Amino acid sequence: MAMEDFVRQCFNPMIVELAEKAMKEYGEDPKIETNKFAAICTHLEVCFMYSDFKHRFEIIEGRDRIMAWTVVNSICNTTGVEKPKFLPDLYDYKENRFIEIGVTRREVHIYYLEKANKIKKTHIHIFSFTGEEMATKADYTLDEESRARIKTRLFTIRQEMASRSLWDSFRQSERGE
Ligand SMILES: O=C1c2c(O)c(=O)ccn2N([C@@H]2c3ccccc3SCc3c2ccc(F)c3F)[C@@H]2COCCN12
Ligand SMILES: [Mn+2]
Ligand SMILES: [Mn+2]
């Protein structure tokens, strides 16, 4: 069972199509980087579930680069929040801060450090496939139920992969050698 076939079966087609466009834009082939194809789908789903819990969250992820920065610029212009160097994933209109969503197959503490290091005001929220999470100042933003649902979906994706013998590959491809 190919990872590419898993992605197209396990994820909603709107998620798959946006993941494909994002990979084309950054010059990556979903037929070759199939684990990355799956990771982008998973992360994209988490961002939509995050902004699902008028609307508290603007979704930056899932847009072509130009539109993504247009939304970021428009928000900064109307709130005076400092424009970030790196594209974030969400904007929280209640806390008035951008959010960076991370999903990792490794230890959350390790991935949190990697993310915090790369961006040096953007709130960070890391999820794992084991039910763990780590967030800036231990401020998890959402209520308990909302995070429990994200954790359950991630764990379900993991078990759906494991049943098709895809988990081990997916786990090891996150960080290079
Ligand atoms: O939006 C993201 C992004 C994140 O937000 C993230 O948390 C991790 C990684 N990201 N990257 C995603 C991405 C997203 C989710 C899971 C893995 C990857 S792996 C690199 C890659 C991404 C998108 C397309 C592509 F072809 C890639 F090679 C790029 C980093 O440059 C800003 C846009 N972006
Ligand atoms: Mn992003
Ligand atoms: Mn992210």
Author numbering: -1 to 51, 73 to 139, 142 to 198
From the paper:
The heterotrimeric RNA-dependent RNA polymerase (RdRp) of influenza virus is composed of subunits PA, PB1 and PB2.
To verify the reduced endonuclease activity of the I38T mutant, we purified the isolated endonuclease domain from influenza A and B virus polymerase with either Ile or Thr at position 38. For influenza A, we used residues 1–198 from strain A/California/04/2009 (pH1N1) with truncation of the flexible loop (Δ52–64:Gly), as previously described. As expected, the head-group binds to the two divalent cations in the endonuclease active center, each metal ion having octahedral co-ordination through interactions with the protein, to the compound or water molecules, as previously described. In FluA wild-type, BXA makes van der Waals contacts with Ala20 and Tyr24 from the C-terminal end of helix α2 and Lys34, Ala37 and Ile38 from helix α3. Tyr24 binds across the two wings of the compound, contacting both the oxazino on the head group and the difluorobenzene on the tail-group. Conserved Ile38 intimately packs into the V of the tail-group in identical fashion in both FluA and FluB, making van der Waals contacts via its CG1 and CD1 atoms. In the absence of BXA, the Tm of all four endonuclease constructs is 46–50 °C. BXA binding to the endonuclease increases very significantly its thermal stability, with the Tm for the wild-type FluA or FluB endonuclease shifting to 78 or 77 °C, respectively, corresponding to ΔTm of +32 and +29 °C, respectively.
